[model samples]
Target: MRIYLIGFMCSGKSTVGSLLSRSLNIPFYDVDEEVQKREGLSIPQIFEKKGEAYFRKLEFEVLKDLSEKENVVISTGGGLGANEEALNFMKSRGTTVFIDIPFEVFLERCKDSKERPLLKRPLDEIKNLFEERRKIYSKADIKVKGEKPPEEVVKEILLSLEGNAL
Candidate 1:
């Protein structure tokens, strides 16, 4: 019962993931946190020092390791699940859920966040990236509207999971 939560930044993947974990009595792992722990640096610092390519490589490695765990929910970093390689890998390993939210909602949710290095880009670039990521994120096995409360989102995910054997 490996579950991967995929979404753009600030879409509440971690929050809903934890709730889903509690409900399912499964472990929960945040890919971003795991990557940070492995690198001993914040995400922004990793991007600044090692570059996005380096960070992505490390993130994919972490995701691969996490996929080996059993009965766990994983909350992926914004860009991690958007990558075709990572998305396909997750699909082959277990179910992937996309926490869908509009770009406007993402901006509103991340308005005050200074930690996301990608958010520092121009508005248009960020919006483009968001839309582009959505195209890939939509490929997930499950899609849940993420603008609602985290609990509601978790309930929805649980319901979706119940419909499938996994």
Candidate 2:
């Protein structure tokens, strides 16, 4: 069973996914890291050079490939999960878990990240993007609030799945 952790940047998907993988004894992959490796460039560098369209195309390919794997936890890039195509693909390929972090908490987490591409934008622009993406994020098959401790959210997700945990 593929457990795909879907959420915005700095929402703790990679961090939570890593812990989940360790607990579940499964391999883990971060979509952005996978994309960087495949493209031989950093995500920000790709965005600066190839543009969003080109980078998203690469993201789609990586998402598609990861969907075919099993017994793994995959954390998606913020933009990648927001792509409708990727969301649909995930619906068919795995158990989708959306880590819904409170907006203020999310802001705090990424505030100090040096290379957040979107963070370079204006505040209104960032807020607008967050609002827009939150609606799409609600489409996940599993939604776990990220404002809580990682251990608590982990417990919540497992309890939510009950007998179906993968």
Top model by lDDT, which number?
A: 1
Stretches of model 2 off by over 4 angstroms after superposition: 111-121
Return the top candidate by TM-score: 1
Cα lDDT of model 1 by residue, 1-166, tens digit: 7999999878999999999999999999999999999899998889899988999899999999988997899999888879999999999989999999987788767643365554455787577777898999999999999999999998898899898974
Candidate 2 clash pair list: none
- Candidate 1: C-alpha RMSD to true structure equals 2.4
lDDT of 2: 0.82
TM-score of model number 1: 0.91
Where model 1 places Cα greater than 4 Å from the true spot, the runs are: 111-122
Candidate 1's displacement at residue 104, Å, is 1.8
* Per-residue lDDT of 107 in model 1: 73
Report residue 109 deviation for candidate 2 (angstroms): 1.7
